[PDB]
Amino acid sequence: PYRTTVEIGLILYGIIYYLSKPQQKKSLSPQEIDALIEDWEPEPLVDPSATDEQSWRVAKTPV
Amino acid sequence: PVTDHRRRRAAAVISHVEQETFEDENDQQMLPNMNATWVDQRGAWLIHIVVIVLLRLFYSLFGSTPKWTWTLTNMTYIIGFYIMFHLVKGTPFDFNGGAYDNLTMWEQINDETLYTPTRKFLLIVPIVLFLISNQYYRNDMTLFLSNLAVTVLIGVVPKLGITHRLRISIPGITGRA
Numbered sequence A: 001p002y003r004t005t006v007e008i009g010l011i012l013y014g015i016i017y018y019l020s021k022p023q024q025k026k027s028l029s030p031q032e033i034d035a036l037i038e039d040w041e042p043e044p045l046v047d048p049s050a051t052d053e054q055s056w057r058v059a060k061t062p063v
Numbered sequence B: 001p002v003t004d005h006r007r008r009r010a011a012a013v014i015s016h017v018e019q020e021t022f023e024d025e026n027d028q029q030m031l032p033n034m035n036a037t038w039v040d041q042r043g044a045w046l047i048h049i050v051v052i053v054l055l056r057l058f059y060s061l062f063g064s065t066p067k068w069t070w071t072l073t074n075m076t077y078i079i080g081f082y083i084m085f086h087l088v089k090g091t092p093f094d095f096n097g098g099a100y101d102n103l104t105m106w107e108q109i110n111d112e113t114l115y116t117p118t119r120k121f122l123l124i125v126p127i128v129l130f131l132i133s134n135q136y137y138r139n140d141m142t143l144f145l146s147n148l149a150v151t152v153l154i155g156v157v158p159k160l161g162i163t164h165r166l167r168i169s170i171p172g173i174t175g176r177a
């Protein structure tokens, strides 16, 4: 009866604990949010490094 | 202050230990703990059976009834395990600067991993011991209730997913963070 019921409860929790999750592993402030904003460095809209070397096409276009 | 390193002692009925900051967690816990590393080693799982057998034989050498012997051995084993693991907080030797001054040995096992085989074994053993032991004092309901209360209250509730980093201020103002 009750003596069997509590034993069944303990055993039932036993298998539940045995087949637990797959080894669960142990796991920001607004003051540092502005630091991330200030650390952002965007890129130029257009790259001008190779403009000079490739500019002969415009100079050779007939008008 | 330029460092702001203080220990808080907030008082409430239910409270939890705050999560460690970057410096305390990612940097001050790098070397082996040397306090919870011996659990997963050679001969660290059979020693509990030897302790139980030795206690049972020592109590049987007195020449008492089986009921009293088994109740006493169960209570002694559970109380000893609780005193060793769950009661004390800290480490017997300085680790870095006192990083583990808010946690017990149970929490430090396997780098605060919730479910590992050793924890499963440690949770399984008291239930099996109780199932084996109850067969001698089933007639007496008071001893059955006492054994059930001891097992559930001491050997089951602390080893749970809940009651992890859980502190109660009833027996003293505990320190968190």
Ligand SMILES: C[C@@H]1CC[C@@]2(OC1)O[C@H]1C[C@H]3[C@@H]4CC=C5C[C@@H](OCCC(CO[C@H]6O[C@H](CO)[C@@H](O[C@H]7O[C@H](CO)[C@@H](O)[C@H](O)[C@H]7O)[C@H](O)[C@H]6O)CO[C@H]6O[C@H](CO)[C@@H](O[C@H]7O[C@H](CO)[C@@H](O)[C@H](O)[C@H]7O)[C@H](O)[C@H]6O)CC[C@]5(C)[C@H]4CC[C@]3(C)[C@H]1[C@@H]2C
Binding pocket: B083, B087, B088, B089, B090, B101, B175
């Ligand atoms: C069958 C039979 C039945 C009968 C029987 O046998 C079996 O049943 C048995 C039942 C047994 C007891 C069961 C369990 C314990 C606790 C254990 O515990 C670890 C060792 C000690 C330290 O533990 C602390 O370790 C950390 C550092 O302290 C704590 O860290 C924080 O606190 C730091 C504070 O700086 C901060 O840095 C941070 O906040 C943070 O780091 C941490 O919280 C806590 O774990 C235990 O406490 C100490 O407490 C005082 C120091 O705090 C000592 O001094 C005091 O001694 C006198 C009294 O007050 C006064 O004259 C002095 O003035 C006054 O100072 C005292 O001697 C000593 O006991 C020590 C053994 C003992 C008592 C057993 C004794 C024997 C029995 C009575 C048997 C018994 C005979």
Ligand SMILES: CCCCCCCCCCCCCCCCCCCCCCCCCCC(=O)N[C@@H](CO)[C@H](O)[C@H](O)CCCCCCCCCCCCCC
Binding pocket: B035, B047, B048, B051, B076, B077, B079, B080, B081, B083, B084, B088, B089, B090, B091, B092, B104, B105
């Ligand atoms: C005649 C008969 C009576 C027999 C009495 C003995 C009862 C035996 C049954 C209960 C014991 C559990 C059985 C499993 C243990 C197997 C052996 C493992 C040995 C490991 C030893 C190395 C561990 C190093 C880490 C140190 C450590 O943990 N530091 C702290 C946390 O960082 C802990 O706070 C600390 O150690 C515990 C405090 C020391 C003992 C407290 C009680 C004072 C003596 C009174 C004894 C009461 C009887 C019950 C224990």
